[PDB]
Amino acid sequence: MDIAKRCESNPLLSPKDLKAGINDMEITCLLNPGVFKFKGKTWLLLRVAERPVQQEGIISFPIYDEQGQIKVMSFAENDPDLDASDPRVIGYKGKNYLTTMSYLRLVSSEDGIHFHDEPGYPPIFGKGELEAFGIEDCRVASTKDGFYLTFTEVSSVAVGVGMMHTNDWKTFEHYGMILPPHNKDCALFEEKINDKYYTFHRPSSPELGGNYIWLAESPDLRHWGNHKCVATTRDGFWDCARVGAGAAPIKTEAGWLEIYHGADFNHRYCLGALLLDLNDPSKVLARSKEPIMEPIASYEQTGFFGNVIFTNGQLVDGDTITIYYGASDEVICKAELSVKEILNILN
Numbered sequence: 001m002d003i004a005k006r007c008e009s010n011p012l013l014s015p016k017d018l019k020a021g022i023n024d025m026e027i028t029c030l031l032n033p034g035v036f037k038f039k040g041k042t043w044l045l046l047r048v049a050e051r052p053v054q055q056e057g058i059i060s061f062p063i064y065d066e067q068g069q070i071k072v073m074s075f076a077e078n079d080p081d082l083d084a085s086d087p088r089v090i091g092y093k094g095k096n097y098l099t100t101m102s103y104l105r106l107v108s109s110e111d112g113i114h115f116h117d118e119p120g121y122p123p124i125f126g127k128g129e130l131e132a133f134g135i136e137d138c139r140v141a142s143t144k145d146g147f148y149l150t151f152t153e154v155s156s157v158a159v160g161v162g163m164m165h166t167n168d169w170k171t172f173e174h175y176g177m178i179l180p181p182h183n184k185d186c187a188l189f190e191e192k193i194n195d196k197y198y199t200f201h202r203p204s205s206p207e208l209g210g211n212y213i214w215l216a217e218s219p220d221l222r223h224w225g226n227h228k229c230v231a232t233t234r235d236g237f238w239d240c241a242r243v244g245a246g247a248a249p250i251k252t253e254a255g256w257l258e259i260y261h262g263a264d265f266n267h268r269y270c271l272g273a274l275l276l277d278l279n280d281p282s283k284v285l286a287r288s289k290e291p292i293m294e295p296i297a298s299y300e301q302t303g304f305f306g307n308v309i310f311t312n313g314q315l316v317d318g319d320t321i322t323i324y325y326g327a328s329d330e331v332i333c334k335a336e337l338s339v340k341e342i343l344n345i346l347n
């Protein structure tokens, strides 16, 4: 029931298309880019995942140590104290680790299809205790007061949400961890409502709850409260295991239109649509029963972690939504959707 016009050039960016940004590492994954416009170009703020060349029978990966220095961790695949069933997150002696380190990297484009690094625009790397395992999946809020980045901060003590601000994409201010663990999928709204700031977010409950889309509000972007549960998973549907907002919602006359991701217990991620009241964004007006984009293309089906569509950045020009997205947690893609057709599906 897929209604997305894929870019014929997909994929736009694969790991081999770029030079590694961490010393002695290679690029495993390009995914989940933020999206904005600046100095006449379309930009992606890529999630770039890197690790050492893998040796037979050894999982090895970078973290930052206490002095901020890359350090390589190694575990034997047959070590009985190792749980490596999932390629993204492992356990060893009761503690969790990632198989890669991620950072944020700017690429630019004149055509919105061929992308390249930009001299003077170096990448954004984890800093501090709370970003020791990297930063990920950055949403970019294009606003009157500039650009606001909301991304996953990962470390041995938390998956949480950080926020940064920039005017020129060279200088940044860090607002710290705005949402504690375990939380991600933080889609900041690009405008105020009732002179208040709003964001979607996505706390995960070990028990007594799940992985649902929530709402919070803020006077100042640094401090958040009045949390509300917007939309849960749906038992026995494609979005039965988790849901999360992608990019900021689009202002329409029907309401706030959010292209959200959902996944089942096999970790197959699809896109869906959510519509929310203009003045109370916690009120669900409508929700696509079926996905509006499933992982159908071949580059969407096999990779580092397969059967995954994921967008946390987009552009809107009239009726035409241009989403950029990660495919199989490996490569960058572009596709187009129609507001009118989405709203039509919701009635």
Ligand SMILES: OC[C@H]1O[C@H](O)[C@@H](O)[C@@H](O)[C@@H]1O
Residues within 6 Å of the ligand: 088, 089, 098, 136, 152, 154, 159
């Ligand atoms: O955030 C930690 C970890 O959580 C999930 O497993 C995925 O989103 C990974 O890509 C990510 O690195």
